Write a protein that binds this ligand. Structure first.
Ligand SMILES: Nc1ncnc2c1ncn2[C@@H]1O[C@H](COP(=O)(O)OP(=O)(O)OP(=O)(O)O)[C@@H](O)[C@H]1O
Ligand SMILES: Nc1ncnc2c1ncn2[C@@H]1O[C@H](COP(=O)(O)OP(=O)(O)OP(=O)(O)O)[C@@H](O)[C@H]1O
Ligand SMILES: Nc1ncnc2c1ncn2[C@@H]1O[C@H](COP(=O)(O)OP(=O)(O)OP(=O)(O)O)[C@@H](O)[C@H]1O
Ligand SMILES: [Mg+2]
Ligand SMILES: [Mg+2]
Lengths: 240, 470, 478, 55, 354, 119
């Protein structure tokens, strides 16, 4: 697939989308035969040439002056351990990174993107804009503050929290729930159709939620909704 | 016959083939001295140590330096004995490497000097001392709460700026002054910057003339980092056995010795032990430690600085090292900031010797009472913080009044601290410090200010300082 | 029949085994028939193990390999300034040849004990937290350790940029990275003007493992050239973990006995050799110095792993960066509690030393006694004074990207913080206070700035209070 | 007044007991964590050496 | 002729390999050219595997190895009482040679099912806590388990001292201990007068691993000599954990695949062999008895570790000494909750057991 | 063999109820470990009250164990076991101390030893 894409990148100068179903299977297949090839095992049973092979494969997928290839790859994490050597070596080859955690999946939030571990080189004030950068940083700060409160909440209850921390939890739960979305391909799993939300609209909605306009809304109204307009309309169905 | 040839080089490991029937013994030292025969060769000056007999007249050795430039078939000569380092009065004030060659620029030792083998068995059963004897160090806190034992091993724990170097220098000075015994410093895995700083500090303090320093640097091979401790111990054993002195031995970090042993085992190919260590971890530690003992004619006491991997005291290296220790000293940054010197933790520090059978009933009782009072003061700290001291009952206030004075009296003015404070130093006998602490506990000096106890020697110096304060 | 030639027996995974080569030295360079180079690492009884420094797909069993008679070495000189180069000394940006007239061996002995001098000159990184709490001196080697996406590269780039007005030569070694990321880093350095005194060494992920293995040593040699010429050099290793992994791969391919976590037995010796060549030279052989900033990437904050423990033991100090601190709003993310500098205060000026002690105590008394803030909302004990001072200190220690601060301005702002001139400004306005205070300083405190820059000491406290009060009466709080 | 004083004293005692219990639980969990870490290192090194010498 | 003479091929880490020795038998003693003893471990088709019982530095490949014709044995007798010897029976106290007149094999079968009797005679240790809560009988095997510096050695020494006026033979085996500590123990025993009936077997930490591995078996053989003559013997193994570590070392140097905590698969059998020899013989066998008090050193009080669990699975009960209780001033820190005697009470006298 | 058609319907129900209460107690043990029984709701407190007594009544004194503790052993029919556990589940003996349920056989011995002690 890589050489098929490289032909278009080099000879015709086209813009190429490269999708890889699972790049971890390349590593796994390479490791399945190392012992038969006669090489001594590495740390977690991987082949000794893990990093070399991964780099030799990944470094060909780049944009040049003759053409550009943007590649989206799905990377499997064995046993949810992000310290596994294959994802650990793969991390250094990427510009933008999306992390999926099954803790959000167990709670019914999809696409279940981790709001903190996800990173991107494009999140800069001069690249995306000052207002967008500040609202994203505020959302990340609120979620980071919320993550610490769960440990003491699960033992001492919400009643012992201060008025500031109660509001922090109140807004953070709503932000986390509004991070959900309904996909077009998710009809088979949700019944309801999907939606397409622009960046300006999502930035505006998260700014409003950070400001606290919708503190009175129930938290369930933010589940797989798209925009905040659909949140306030879905609230009417519950009598709020 | 004494000539071999290099047959196989793989990193720090070199295999040498000898003539049939003339193989060198284990732990023997081999020498390679080569001059570039042409433009495609480099000069070599390397020393090897025999490790195994592989059969077919071949021997596996570990290099004491870099093996770069070695060529198969080049000549190797056998010295017929293990590594030998100079011993005697010539080693005082000098800095050596693992080979026994001087590192400093003061010149080389003449070939007519006596040299002793690095590897030797421990002293026999009937040559040991029959009774436990206490070593007086002259430091009040050490002599009271964590007494030292002649021939015993003491662990040292502390922070970055607690004052471990100052304590070591003061111990060297006091022992040389009051017992006539020299000290040896073994820099196992010593950083070069730290070694240079330590050499300059020793020269400034003047204890350099009474000490011999051996440095095994970080950039040296695992064999050298293994054998530095042994060569320092060999240098100390001469003064134990011949002069009959009581000698002090300092080890930079024994954990680096164990790690060097593990690396050597891994290079040799032996299967790893429980947590990746060498199978011979206990054997190597015992071989090192059992030579630090007290005999009928002298003794060697050793101070180890110990690193605990991942703060786990159950880890095999700390577990094996702790089996040989007789005492423990912990240095506290809290006390260092509070102005307490030496910064020795009065509660965390422990010693096997603090038993009435060997230290004395009065000494034991006084030490236990002091520790109990300090524990009570530590317990009262949170309530003293939250509420004023007046709120405490009269008994608790009396306890605090005693405890602050005791805590200040645990400090001492060191001889080597004159460079910092201008004032001289003191050497306090154990009986003197016991009597002083007993008098303090009995309330003899409750009316004196707490700053008169700050940095003194005898208990009378507190009275003199109070009289001068007025 | 001659002993300076051999034939290849086995080829695969980037290594070759050849019969012959009777007189080859350990670590010597060898040349294959097709023109690629190799290094002889294993000298067995009947064969030589060779690591290949290029594409091995053109090498076949039975072809010829020849001696070169020399140890691996790289070009050194002033012509490398402003260039990006591979570990072998060949340019990768085009722009023509390098035109270097001198060379230096990769493996060289480190300076001895008697050749060195105590570290006494500060290395100004332009970061307030580093300059105040974990000082770095010229000749010191300081470890920068943390997880992924935490700011280690940003710290290194800021430190390199801050060296513009100081007689310091910088070398950046990129190991195992993307060539796109290296290109971006070089572009940022060119934009900020660092290429006038910076050298870049790259061993990307697509390069053979021996090149990643050899890159930091090439950087060390290039630095040592200037150091022994009498100048000061700063060398940065962006990942030692990738270099260690490459060495592990080579050792496993050469069938050497593995140790803990499959690493070879001399992995500690490798890094000790690398990091022991940074030194501060005595005046007897020139006052030049070389300082090193190795990087280590931890996994889930585990600093007890093999390589992290080795590098922590080897280095003179550690700067810990935390992801929770990064996401809490502390962009520098330096954990002052765990970060340690073992040369500190010898690597600071008097003005900085006279405020750093108070700053450290304030930060410690905040970090401990933290978690009382929620119950400190109910005002109790007047501990709220300590809480407010700690909060303002934390707000002061924050910094932005690629904006290093002059040491005199750092000293002035830390003095203002520690003397209580910020106690009535809310924490929300501390950043604005500092930003406008810098402009007020460069407008009306040139005498104080010049006094600090010349005498390395604080100005008169009365004049300092006068200037601070004059600015503070004009600062509007909102 | 008596009720408020009793309530404050009871809260203080309960929080002290809870803190002590939490400290003891932390100690036991740390011991278990260290044992598990040692076991994991042992298993990984044993597998490494077995695979290496199985050739 | 290589029937009774061999030649060394490999030397290293205390394990040697020899060529020849066609008539040697498994488990035989061999003698090296410099007088160092060895044990024939493996009889390969072409070579012999030998375990060196001493300093192996003086052994070089190409040296001569000759047969002794005797299974691995130790000297026994009444002349060994009051002496300090190594696991090979060589005196180390410096009082001259030991005039024993017979030997016993180190490896010997344990008494059978029908050769034993129920334990019914009390072994008075002289310690109130043990004699009340955890009674010990003659022929019982009781484990003493605890952390470092908790009083196990003191308990053993007090038990040995209490046997002054009772017809008991005491054997103290110190595996991996410090020579200074063994010297102090010997001096205390001499001062209290226990050397009239005590044999001390020592193997310090600086000795090679095979000697530490062999020491408990030499001690139990010396005890069995008196046990099978109608007398009563008490044997104390000062540390079985040291022996287990030494045996793990030896197994790893033999390249045997390790198991749990890198210990070999036969680590259980190692201690079962040793502890199954202590028994109470029947009237038909003479009525003699042997009592064993093995020691195990735990880490942070972890009684569920592999070696402690293995030793608990063998003995007839255990006495647990608790570190924090020891530091609280209760020096005989018997943890009554975790200490039990399975065959006690039947040996306890009637007056005490009410 | 724990099936309704093998052991009987009431046997199966009693066993399932006992297992359910024990599972709930096991779940609560984490909270009781740190902050005790004070913050438990009235339902959880009753669950703990019943579960401790059930767990103690699961103990028995053995004939063989007479050599270790001088007490004689007991043999308990399965019908008596079912009746006793059903009575404990129904809350008949909530007022008895929990230490009276240890090392006894039939449910009558619990009452007998509770009467022997203070009650
Ligand atoms: N007894 C003392 N009297 C006065 N000042 C002291 C004393 N001990 C230590 N200090 C002060 O503390 C500083 C740190 O002491 P020192 O150099 O011994 O540290 P250290 O803990 O041994 O160092 P490291 O761990 O880096 O080797 C000294 O430079 C000195 O200023
Ligand atoms: N002081 C700062 N203020 C704002 N953003 C910062 C700051 N420091 C770093 N960042 C940003 O945080 C991210 C960290 O990137 P950086 O390359 O510095 O990290 P790294 O630890 O080297 O990561 P890696 O090599 O794993 O990608 C970048 O997006 C960078 O722009
Ligand atoms: N009953 C007792 N009363 C007072 N002190 C005691 C008592 N029992 C032991 N000790 C002392 O406590 C310490 C425990 O040492 P001992 O050798 O008895 O313990 P151990 O468990 O064998 O230790 P180690 O691992 O060091 O061999 C010694 O100092 C000993 O003198
Ligand atoms: Mg980076
Ligand atoms: Mg003992």
């Amino acid at each position: 697939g890589l050489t098929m894409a490289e032909y278009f990148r080099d000879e015709q100068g086209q813009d190429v989308l490269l999708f890889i179903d699972n790049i971890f299977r390349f590593t796994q297949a390479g490791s399945e035969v190392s012992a038969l090839l006669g090489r001594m095992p590495s740390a977690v049973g991987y082949q000794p040439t893990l990093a070399t092979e991964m780099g030799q494969l990944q470094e060909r997928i780049t944009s040049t002056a003759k053409g550009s290839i943007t590649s989206i790859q799905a990377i499997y994490v064995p046993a949810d351990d992000y310290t596994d050597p294959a994802p650990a070596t793969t991390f250094s080859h990427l510009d933008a990174t999306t992390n999926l955690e099954r803790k959000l999946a167990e709670m019914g939030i999809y696409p279940a993107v981790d709001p903190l571990a996800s990173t991107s080189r494009a999140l800069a004030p001069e690249i995306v804009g000052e207002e967008h950068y500040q609202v994203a940083r505020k959302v990340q700060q609120t979620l980071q503050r919320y993550k610490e409160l769960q440990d003491i909440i699960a033992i001492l209850g919400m009643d012992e929290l201060s008025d500031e921390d109660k509001l922090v939890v109140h807004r953070a739960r709503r932000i986390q729930f509004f991070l959900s979305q309904n996909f077009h391909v998710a009809e088979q799993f949700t019944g309801q159709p999907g939606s397409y939300v622009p960046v300006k609209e999502t930035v505006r909605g998260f700014k409003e939620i950070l400001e606290g306009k919708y503190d009175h809304l129930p938290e369930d109204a933010f589940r797989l909704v798209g925009r905040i307009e659909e949140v306030v309309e879905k609230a009417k169905a519950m009598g709020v | 016959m004494t000539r071999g040839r290099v047959i196989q080089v793989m990193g720090p490991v070199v295999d040498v083939k000898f003539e049939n029937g003339h193989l060198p013994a284990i732990y023997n030292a081999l020498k390679i001295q080569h001059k570039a025969r042409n433009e495609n060769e480099v000069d070599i000056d390397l020393t090897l140590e025999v490790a195994l007999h592989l059969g077919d007249d071949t021997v596996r050795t570990i290099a004491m330096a870099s093996t770069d430039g070695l060529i198969r078939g080049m000549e190797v000569i056998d010295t017929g004995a293990p590594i030998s380092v100079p011993v005697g009065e010539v080693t005082l004030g000098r800095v050596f490497n693992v080979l026994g060659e001087p590192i400093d620029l003061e010149g080389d030792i003449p070939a007519d000097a006596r040299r002793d083998p690095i590897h030797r068995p421990a002293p026999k059963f009937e040559e040991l001392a029959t009774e436990v004897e206490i070593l007086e160090t002259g430091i009040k806190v050490v002599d009271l709460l964590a007494p030292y034992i002649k021939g015993g091993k003491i662990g040292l724990f502390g922070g970055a700026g607690v004052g471990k170097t100052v304590l070591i220098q003061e111990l060297i000075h006091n022992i040389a002054q009051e017992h006539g015994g020299i000290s040896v410093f073994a820099g196992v895995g010593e950083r070069t910057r730290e070694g240079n700083d330590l050499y300059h500090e020793m020269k400034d303090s003047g204890v350099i003339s009474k000490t011999a320093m051996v440095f095994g640097q970080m950039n040296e091979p695992p064999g050298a980092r293994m054998r530095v401790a042994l060569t320092g111990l060999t240098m100390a054993e001469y003064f134990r056995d011949e002069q009959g002195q009581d000698v002090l031995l300092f080890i930079d970090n024994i954990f680096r010795f164990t790690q060097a042993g593990s690396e050597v085992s891994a290079l040799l190919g032996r299967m790893p032990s429980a947590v990746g260590y060498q199978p011979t971890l206990a054997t190597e530690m015992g071989q090192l430690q059992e030579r630090i003992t007290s005999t009928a004619k002298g003794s060697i006491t050793s101070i180890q600085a110990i690193y605990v991997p991942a703060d786990d005291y159950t880890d095999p290296a700390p577990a094996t090292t702790f089996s040989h220790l007789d005492a423990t000293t912990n240095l506290e940054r809290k006390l260092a900031e509070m102005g307490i010197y030496p910064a020795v933790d009065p509660l965390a520090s422990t010693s096997r010797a603090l038993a009435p059978e060997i230290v004395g009933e009065e000494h034991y009782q006084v030490a236990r009472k002091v520790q109990q009072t300090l524990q009570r003061y530590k317990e009262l700290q949170d309530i003293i913080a939250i509420l004023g001291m007046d709120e405490l009952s009269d008994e608790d206030k009396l306890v605090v009044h005693r405890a602050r004075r005791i805590q200040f009296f645990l400090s001492q003015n060191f001889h080597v601290a004159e460079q910092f404070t201008g004032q001289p130093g003191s050497y306090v006998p154990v009986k003197e410090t016991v009597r002083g602490f007993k008098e303090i506990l009995e309330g003899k000096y409750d009316h004196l200010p707490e700053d008169a106890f700050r940095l003194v020697g005898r208990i009378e110096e507190v009275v003199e300082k109070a009289k001068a304060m007025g | 029949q001659v002993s300076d030639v051999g034939t290849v027996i086995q080829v695969g995974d980037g290594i070759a085994r050849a019969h012959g080569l009777d007189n080859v030295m350990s670590g010597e360079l060898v040349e294959f028939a097709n023109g690629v180079m190799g290094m002889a690492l294993n000298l067995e009884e009947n064969n030589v193990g060779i690591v290949i420094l290029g594409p091995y797909t053109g090498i076949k069993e039975g072809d010829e390999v020849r001696r070169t008679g020399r140890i691996m070495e790289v070009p050194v000189g002033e012509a490398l300034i402003g260039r990006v180069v591979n570990p072998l000394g060949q340019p990768v940006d085009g722009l023509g040849p390098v035109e270097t007239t001198e060379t230096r061996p990769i493996e060289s002995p480190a300076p001895g004990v008697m050749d060195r001098r105590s570290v006494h000159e500060p290395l100004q990184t332009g970061i307030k937290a580093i300059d105040a709490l974990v000082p770095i001196g010229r000749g010191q080697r300081e470890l920068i350790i943390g997880d992924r996406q935490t700011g280690k590269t940003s710290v290194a780039i800021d430190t390199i940029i801050n060296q513009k007005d100081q007689n310091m030569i910088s070398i950046y070694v990129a190991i195992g990275q993307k060539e796109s990321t290296v290109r971006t880093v070089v572009e940022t350095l060119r934009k900020h003007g660092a290429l006038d005194y910076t050298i870049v060494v790259t061993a990307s992920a697509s390069q053979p493992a021996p090149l990643l293995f050899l890159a930091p040593y090439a950087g060390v040699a290039m630095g040592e050239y200037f150091m022994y010429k009498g100048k000061h050099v700063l060398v940065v290793y962006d990942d030692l973990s990738k270099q260690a992994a490459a060495y592990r791969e080579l050792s496993l391919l050469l069938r050497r006995p593995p140790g803990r976590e499959a690493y070879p037995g001399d992995i500690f010796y490798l890094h000790s050799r690398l990091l022991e060549r940074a030194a501060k030279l005595s005046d007897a052989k020139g006052g030049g110095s070389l300082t090193a900033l190795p990087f280590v990437e931890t996994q889930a904050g585990d600093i007890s792993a093999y390589i992290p423990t080795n590098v922590i033991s080897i280095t003179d100090g550690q700067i810990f960066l935390q992801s929770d601190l990064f996401f809490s709003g502390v962009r520098p993310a330096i954990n002052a509690g765990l970060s340690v500098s073992r040369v500190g205060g010898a690597a600071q000026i008097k003005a900085m030393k006279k405020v750093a002690g108070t700053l450290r105590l304030d930060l410690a008394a905040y970090r401990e006694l933290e978690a009382f803030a929620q119950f400190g909302s109910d005002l109790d004990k007047a501990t709220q004074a300590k809480l407010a001072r700690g909060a303002r200190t934390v707000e002061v220690l924050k910094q932005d990207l690629h904006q290093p601060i002059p040491v005199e301005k750092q000293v002035l702002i830390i003095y203002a913080l520690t003397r209580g001139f910020l106690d009535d400004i809310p924490v929300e306005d501390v950043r604005r206070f500092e930003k406008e205070f810098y402009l007020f300083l460069d407008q009306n405190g040139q005498h104080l700035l010049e006094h600090i820059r010349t005498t390395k000491d604080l100005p008169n406290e009365d004049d300092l209070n006068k200037a601070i009060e004059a600015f503070k009466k004009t600062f509007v709080v909102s | 007044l008596d009720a408020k004083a009793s309530e404050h004293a009871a809260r203080m005692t309960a929080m002290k007991n809870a803190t002590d219990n939490a400290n003891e639980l932390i100690r036991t969990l740390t011991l278990s964590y260290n044992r598990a870490r040692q076991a994991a290192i042992t298993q990984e090194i044993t597998e490494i050496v077995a695979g290496a010498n199985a050739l």
